[PDB]
Amino acid sequence: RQHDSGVNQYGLKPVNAYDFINPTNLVNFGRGTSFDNLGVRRAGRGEIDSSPSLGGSPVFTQAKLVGLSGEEQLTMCQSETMALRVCMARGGQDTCERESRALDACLSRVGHLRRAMSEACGEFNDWFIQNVSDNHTKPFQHR
């Protein structure tokens, strides 16, 4: 047809008796409800009620997997620094004499690399939302 069948022009479509006695549920699901996101208690990205849920419990460590903000090593400029025990112990804050060229050479790849890993994790959420997330419709199992 021309529209999706899980919504009506007034909200979500009531299916069972619960929906018909409590029709708040059809038009309100958190401080981030929007008429496009109706009922779907995952709503947009970044807004409230957006987290994908893996079998009931919701997901909030999406970067903490890739290693952004979880276990930040990235090693590309890190090995460079740890190497330069001269320009690590100098006034540690110059384009100092020689090695701060190589420090920024490593970091130039760090930047592109972490942009690629971040886009990876963005596509990861946008995949795991398709083909794993129950959308919080199944009961918790983390307890």
Binding site: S57, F124, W127, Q141, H142, R143
Partner: peptide
């Protein structure tokens, strides 16, 4: 038990991540 269980949960997540990466 809560930890064995929550770890068993996040192992599901880690593995979806790994199977994606």
């Amino acid at each position: 038990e809560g930890e064995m269980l929550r770890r068993r949960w996040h192992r599901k997540l880690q593995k979806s991540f790994i199977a994606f990466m």
